[PDB]
Design an enzyme around this catalytic site. Structure first.
Site, PDB file in Angstrom:
ATOM      1  N   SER B  78       0.757  -1.130  -0.069  1.00 17.38           N
ATOM      2  CA  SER B  78      -0.075   0.018  -0.102  1.00 17.38           C
ATOM      3  C   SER B  78       0.821   1.361   0.146  1.00 17.38           C
ATOM      4  O   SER B  78       1.971   1.368   0.638  1.00 17.38           O
ATOM      5  CB  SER B  78      -1.035   0.095   1.379  1.00 17.38           C
ATOM      6  OG  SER B  78      -0.260  -0.303   2.329  1.00 17.38           O
ATOM      7  N   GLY B  79       0.544   2.224  -0.929  1.00 22.74           N
ATOM      8  CA  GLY B  79       1.182   3.417  -0.987  1.00 22.74           C
ATOM      9  C   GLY B  79       2.565   3.302  -1.377  1.00 22.74           C
ATOM     10  O   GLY B  79       3.501   4.281  -1.544  1.00 22.74           O
ATOM     11  N   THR B  83      -0.769   5.433  -5.231  1.00 22.90           N
ATOM     12  CA  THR B  83      -1.227   6.523  -5.407  1.00 22.90           C
ATOM     13  C   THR B  83      -0.025   7.250  -6.678  1.00 22.90           C
ATOM     14  O   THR B  83      -0.578   7.921  -7.304  1.00 22.90           O
ATOM     15  CB  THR B  83      -0.837   7.636  -4.033  1.00 22.90           C
ATOM     16  OG1 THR B  83       0.303   7.428  -3.537  1.00 22.90           O
ATOM     17  CG2 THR B  83      -2.241   6.972  -3.165  1.00 22.90           C
ATOM     18  N   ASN B 123       4.109   0.722   5.065  1.00 21.72           N
ATOM     19  CA  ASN B 123       3.707   2.143   4.797  1.00 21.72           C
ATOM     20  C   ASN B 123       2.792   2.604   5.980  1.00 21.72           C
ATOM     21  O   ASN B 123       1.909   1.923   6.682  1.00 21.72           O
ATOM     22  CB  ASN B 123       2.842   2.061   3.532  1.00 21.72           C
ATOM     23  CG  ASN B 123       2.445   3.306   3.022  1.00 21.72           C
ATOM     24  OD1 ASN B 123       1.534   4.303   3.515  1.00 21.72           O
ATOM     25  ND2 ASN B 123       3.236   3.524   1.925  1.00 21.72           N
ATOM     26  N   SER B 126      -0.793   3.816   5.272  1.00 26.56           N
ATOM     27  CA  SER B 126      -1.282   2.780   4.318  1.00 26.56           C
ATOM     28  C   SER B 126      -2.507   2.433   4.125  1.00 26.56           C
ATOM     29  O   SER B 126      -3.460   2.396   5.037  1.00 26.56           O
ATOM     30  CB  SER B 126      -0.566   1.442   4.613  1.00 26.56           C
ATOM     31  OG  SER B 126      -0.997   1.267   5.966  1.00 26.56           O
ATOM     32  N   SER B 127      -3.080   2.088   2.606  1.00 28.54           N
ATOM     33  CA  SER B 127      -4.488   1.682   2.623  1.00 28.54           C
ATOM     34  C   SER B 127      -4.506   0.408   2.906  1.00 28.54           C
ATOM     35  O   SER B 127      -4.033  -0.561   2.437  1.00 28.54           O
ATOM     36  CB  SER B 127      -4.856   1.986   1.236  1.00 28.54           C
ATOM     37  OG  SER B 127      -5.453   3.053   0.933  1.00 28.54           O
ATOM     38  N   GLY B 349      -0.602  -4.785  -1.821  1.00 27.19           N
ATOM     39  CA  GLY B 349      -0.536  -6.132  -2.427  1.00 27.19           C
ATOM     40  C   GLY B 349       0.130  -7.300  -1.743  1.00 27.19           C
ATOM     41  O   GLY B 349      -0.110  -7.231  -0.455  1.00 27.19           O
ATOM     42  N   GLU B 351       1.598  -8.968   0.895  1.00 25.29           N
ATOM     43  CA  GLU B 351       2.300  -8.279   2.128  1.00 25.29           C
ATOM     44  C   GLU B 351       3.109  -9.095   2.654  1.00 25.29           C
ATOM     45  O   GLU B 351       2.655  -9.944   3.385  1.00 25.29           O
ATOM     46  CB  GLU B 351       1.105  -7.719   3.004  1.00 25.29           C
ATOM     47  CG  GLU B 351       0.528  -6.420   2.404  1.00 25.29           C
ATOM     48  CD  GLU B 351       1.390  -5.292   1.940  1.00 25.29           C
ATOM     49  OE1 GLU B 351       2.596  -5.428   2.298  1.00 25.29           O
ATOM     50  OE2 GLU B 351       1.024  -4.337   1.449  1.00 25.29           O
TER      51      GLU B 351
END
Lengths: 375, 607, 375
Positions: B78-79, B83, B123, B126-127, B349, B351
């Site tokens: 994430s991140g 983005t 992150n 992080s999303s 993704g 992780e």
């Protein structure tokens, strides 16, 4: 239905039958095992023109009906009316075809072979169930209680059982298959109502008396105090009206019922009680292991719905123990239908995949497949 | 070394297998400008060197010119380029097409930061969900719409958190950032005076609950939330938080109802405007939904505090869901042709994490099914290769390298799969983590990538040979974030709220475990990725600390595998990885055993 | 190997196998050579899903347990129970695998080939011990208190043994392998308890009796007098109760056991006396040498740990000897575990690196390498 077996359930005891399915903690439907049939069926001035009054349908015009019991003490007796009840349970109450979902038909432990055969064949010839578990009516009370072991009681309206869970679990000499239940409770209430003067002879009036009991009844922790209380309608001699103009004043006779469950001396023959053969089940367990079952005195059934069943039965069982061992009754958040709850929860996990009679299990192994799958 | 020295020579954008590896500098490289917007408008993935605009044109010209909806796959931490690559394509299209609406995405994101993004290891902002930004294009391929949507809202994280993984940041944003005026409007007990926010990071790393909480409020407003709509949102954050503190006292036999001290219920119900007594007693006494009847076999206080955690979970879940709803309200144009569209991906993704638990099992399995689409479309382009030439070799479906990792998580009965073993044990009137690991072990063979650990380790732990590489899972704390006896009586009370926006969140009112909910959120993001020509942009870490121009090829392949791009490269290898051109073969191999075939020979084949 | 060999210590005899580490003065655990195995291990309220209960774990659930024995008479009666014993000793009690942890086990001298083959195999086929050692149970008890010379009678709750050390070391016809262990005092105890009215039949009740013999027991200095006292509950009639209310007021029976320690023929066997065979293994050499054997009669092991043991045995050897050569008994600072303590000392010492059974030692030199290393 859901990603489980989601197996249907006929918690079919002898005084009540509970429809439902897996992933549930309480009976989906409750309709008495009593299926009814009118006395003057045809056309009357009074009645409502039906034939096989599946469940509480039976209880309607007892003044001009009669009321049979397709299950009697777990003996699934009228498997025509029990097919009425299985139609009711799955095809009508569940309204989800028995023919489509694995079903679960509950039975007195050590029930006659014939009743097992009925349950299975019928799920697989009358209700074409993919895979039905003829589930142990008591062991389901056990599974519902959050337990898989202990003293496993299923007490009353319907039929009483007590499964021990030890080195043994199910034998024609290890499980209490107690035909002393809310059925005998009802019959005794009828007898003593006649004693007072409330003449009840027909099975319509016997079900009048059963609906009296199941509401006008008391697990008599002290039968005799409340008996003197209930010589007149104080708090324990209650009335019951059939809508034809019949008021029944039930004396001590309310709590004279469950005591038949516990102390059958109310009847007058040479027989045994509930907690007694309950401990007979616990006693097949070793010293340490009767001690073991004592913890889980799981209880369910119809007489478990009369005031004091936990106190009565546990007073008794604690007394029915070496004093080096204390006993505690497990009370499901619903007992009389914890049979249903345990069967459905067994249906919920992978466990039902391990326990049904398949339709094929039946068609191949005959109906004896019950024995070959579950006693 | 290609990846490494390329990035080092600037080339963050390396093609790999057949993917635009963005070894993310976390700076949006000016390969997104209008010059590159058009230097790629007309120029799909392989048409030009490796670019989110090569693939952004794959997407676009599929959208305008092929009239095919699109989805710019952008997977990885994430991140870690999410983005980055997402706004890459967003701008590609913004000038290629008519974008504007994704601009509220960028103000959606702080709110997504608040209630949807939870901190994670690689992150901080992080999303903990994966979102997709569907830019909706005219038949002329013109950005008349753009709507974002988040899945993998770890309602578990809304209640029980992961290591280096805060709750959905707002819970923190709330206590620190929401004013003490709000902290009482929101009855905000402290970060760890709330059962949630148990994660140590009060603020987001490199960030603060205060400033991103104000991002939360203001961005909610830019999406359309009043600061009283926001403040009821925040009451929800805080009342979810209150829920874990709402404990319903239990009994020795399987019983139904006890919680006299409903002061934490008093708080949740002041925030939600719902009744403390209805909330409480109906978690004491919920009507357990069982069939033709909904019986008062009132949930055992096991299931009562489980209904508490369920209320917090689904409460904050629909909180951020209504939040992302307002996000899309002011985010998307209500007018759009959108006859084509581009779902650009921002997910955590594969992780490679230290906590691999319920939320992390669902996240890693989510990225499993995502990189399955990814590697299957790699299989698509590899087949495109072999069919381009006369190639007798059409090597294996390559996303298949992912499948045994996947049903490992999924199988719900018939001895079942991991997250669904969890689901089974949540279908119980009680909680059975013991039968959960029973199922884990007995079912490890019923899975095909279940690494049930050793004789002593498997007893509560195991592993799951994820396509992130094997990921070890201790599945013992999953039922508490998965039991979810969402008390329909109490959630209806949340609809019976006197805080009306709180009712707006759960105008929606036992079983249906959260493992199934998170598989659901996976499948949502997976369809958003796959429903199109999955556009090959990759988000790669040269450092997950959000760095530029710094790299170790280590972290490159870390995210490649995390994007499956190491796997996609092996998969080009699993297929025909290289292709020596005919005349390339003639040059190369006139000297190498041609001997009657001088290089530049006549017969493409026969030479 | 391992300058201070860390070598795990298994004081394994018929009874207490003692677990521990190199260089310690008391075993890291103590648990008899007894493994419990229930009758049917059903799904009880009290069950364990396990069947192998090593040590006192056998003594635990005897109400349903049959109790087998890894060692009896210093003979490994079950190497798989000795697998259990060293899983216990090392894997469980030492909580460090005998694999990778040298195991200075114990083993009686003159043990049949089976026991040595097992100990080494178990240690190198169940426990893969990098360096097992079975040192002389008796010479281990010797090494416990820091000795190197003297007649060291060791009767653990395993076999009764004595190795008379002198200016050199003992003889094979002057080494006591007495048909005696904790098991024999136990079984005699069971029989004599059944005599007075405390009946024992099963290994459950026999091991009730073994824990009696180990604890409700006393080295009888005036055996028959104490017997008369303890024929009624007066001074040594001391009740162990099986926890079902089985009163076993072990009277005369208690100290009747260590009388089988001093006189193992009470059971029906034709074996000799313990202190007698001390004197015998003493005499078998020259004046100066048999005299050195006379001198230091370390009484050691478990069965020499009852009240009155040392001076009983010492009066014994004196009366059982000429007056030309004296005899003295050593009480190890922890006598029941002196076998284990000497194992632990030899382990810490360089001597385990001079005396031990390597895994390869068994694998190449055959299991007779224990024969080559156990003496």
């Amino acid at each position: 239905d859901e990603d489980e077996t989601t197996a249907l359930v006929c918690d079919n005891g002898s005084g009540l039958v509970k429809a439902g399915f897996a992933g549930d903690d309480a009976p989906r439907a409750v309709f008495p095992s009593i299926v009814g049939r009118p006395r003057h069926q045809g056309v009357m001035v009074g009645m409502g023109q039906k034939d096989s009054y599946v469940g509480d349908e039976a209880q309607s015009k007892r003044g001009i009906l009669t009321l049979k019991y397709p299950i009697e003490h777990g003996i699934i007796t009228n498997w025509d009316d029990m097919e009425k009840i299985w139609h009711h349970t799955f095809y009508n109450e569940l309204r989800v075809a028995p023919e489509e979902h694995p079903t679960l038909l509950t039975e007195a432990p050590l029930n006659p072979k014939a009743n097992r055969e009925k349950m299975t064949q019928i799920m697989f010839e009358t209700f074409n169930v993919p895979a039905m578990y003829v589930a142990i009516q008591a062991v389901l009370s056990l599974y519902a209680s959050g337990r898989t072991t202990g003293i496993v009681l299923d007490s009353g309206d319907g039929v009483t059982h007590n499964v021990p869970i030890y080195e043994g679990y199910a034998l024609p000499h290890a499980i209490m298959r107690l035909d002393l239940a809310g059925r005998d409770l009802t019959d005794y209430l009828m007898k003593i109502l006649t004693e007072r003067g409330y003449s009840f002879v027909t099975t319509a009036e016997r079900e009048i008396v059963r609906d009296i009991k199941e509401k006008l009844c008391y697990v008599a922790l002290d039968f005799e105090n409340e008996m003197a209380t209930a010589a007149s309608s104080s708090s324990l001699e209650k009335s019951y009206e059939l809508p034809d103009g019949q008021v029944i004043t039930i004396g001590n006779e309310r709590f004279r019922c469950p005591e038949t469950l516990f102390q059958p001396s109310f009847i007058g023959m040479e027989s045994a009680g509930i907690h007694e053969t309950t401990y007979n089940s616990i006693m097949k367990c070793d010293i340490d292991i009767r001690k073991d079952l004592y913890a889980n005195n799981v209880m369910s059934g119809g007489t478990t719905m009369y005031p004091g069943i936990a106190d009565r039965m546990q007073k008794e069982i604690t007394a029915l123990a070496p004093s080096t061992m204390k006993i505690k009754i497990i009370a499901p958040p619903e007992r009389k239908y914890s049979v249903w709850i345990g069967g459905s929860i067994l249906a919920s996990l992978s466990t039902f995949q391990q326990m049904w009679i398949t339709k094929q299990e039946y068609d191949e192994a005959g109906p004896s497949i019950v024995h070959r799958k579950c006693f | 070394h290609n990846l490494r020295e390329r990035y080092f020579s600037g080339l963050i954008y390396t093609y790999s297998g057949l993917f635009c590896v963005v070894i993310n500098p976390y700076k949006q490289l000016p390969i997104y400008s209008e010059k590159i917007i058009d230097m790629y408008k007309g120029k799909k993935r392989h048409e030009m060197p490796p670019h989110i605009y090569a693939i952004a044109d794959t997407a676009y010209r599929s959208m305008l010119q092929d009239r095919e909806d699109q989805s710019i796959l952008c997977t990885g931490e994430s991140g870690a380029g999410k983005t980055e690559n997402t706004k890459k394509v967003i701008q590609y299209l913004a000038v290629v097409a008519s974008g504007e609406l994704e601009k509220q995405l960028l103000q959606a994101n702080p709110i997504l930061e608040a209630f949807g993004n939870a901190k994670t290891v690689k992150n901080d902002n992080s999303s903990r969900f994966g979102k997709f930004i569907r830019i909706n294009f005219d038949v002329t391929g013109y950005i008349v719409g753009a709507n974002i949507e988040t899945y993998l809202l770890e309602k578990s994280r809304a209640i029980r958190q992961a290591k280096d993984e805060r709750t959905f940041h707002i819970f923190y944003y709330l206590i620190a950032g929401a004013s003490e005026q709000m902290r009482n409007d929101l009855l905000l007990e402290g970060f760890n005076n709330y059962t949630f926010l148990s994660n140590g990071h009060v603020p987001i790393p490199a960030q603060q609950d205060d400033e991103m909480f104000q991002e939360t409020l203001e961005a909610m407003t830019i999406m359309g939330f009043t600061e009283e709509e926001q403040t009821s949102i925040l009451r929800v954050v805080s009342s979810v938080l209150q829920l874990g503190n709402i404990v319903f006292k239990k009994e020795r036999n399987t019983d139904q109802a006890s919680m006299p001290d409903n002061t934490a219920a008093q708080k949740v119900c002041h925030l939600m405007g719902i009744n403390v007594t209805d909330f409480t007693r109906s978690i004491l006494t919920p009507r357990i939904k069982v069939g033709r009847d909904v019986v008062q076999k009132a949930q055992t206080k096991e299931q009562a505090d489980f209904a508490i955690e369920a209320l917090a979970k689904a409460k904050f879940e629909r909180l951020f869901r209504w939040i992302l709803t307002r996000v899309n309200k002011a985010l998307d144009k209500t007018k759009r042709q959108g006859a084509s569209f581009l779902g650009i991906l921002d997910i955590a993704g594969f992780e490679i994490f230290e906590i691999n638990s319920f939320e992390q099992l669902c996240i890693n399995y989510t990225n499993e099914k995502l990189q399955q689409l990814f590697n299957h479309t790699m299989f698509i382009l590899e087949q495109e290769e072999y069919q381009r030439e006369g190639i007798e070799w059409n090597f294996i479906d390559f996303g298949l390298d992912l499948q045994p990792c996947i049903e490992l998580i999924e199988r719900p009965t018939n001895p079942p799969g991991v997250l669904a073993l969890l689901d089974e044990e949540c279908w119980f009137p009680k909680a059975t983590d013991t039968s959960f690991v029973e199922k884990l072990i007995q079912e490890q063979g019923n899975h095909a990538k279940f690494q049930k650990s050793k004789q002593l380790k498997d007893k509560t732990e195991f592993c799951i040979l994820h396509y992130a590489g094997k990921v070890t899972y201790n599945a013992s704390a999953w039922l508490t974030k998965n039991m979810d006896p969402l008390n329909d009586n109490v959630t209806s009370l949340l609809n019976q709220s006197s805080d009306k926006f709180v009712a707006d969140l759960w105008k929606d009112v036992m079983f249906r475990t959260v493992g199934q909910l998170y598989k659901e959120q996976l499948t949502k993001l997976m369809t958003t990725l796959r429903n199109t020509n999955p556009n090959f942009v990759r988000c790669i870490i040269p450092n997950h600390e959000k760095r530029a121009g710094k790299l170790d090829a280590h972290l490159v392949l870390e995210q490649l595998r995390c994007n499956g791009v190491l796997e996609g490269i092996r998969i080009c290898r699993q297929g025909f990885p290289n292709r020596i051109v005919f005349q390339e073969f003639r040059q190369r191999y006139e000297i190498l055993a041609a001997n009657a075939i001088p290089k530049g020979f006549m017969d493409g084949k026969q030479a």
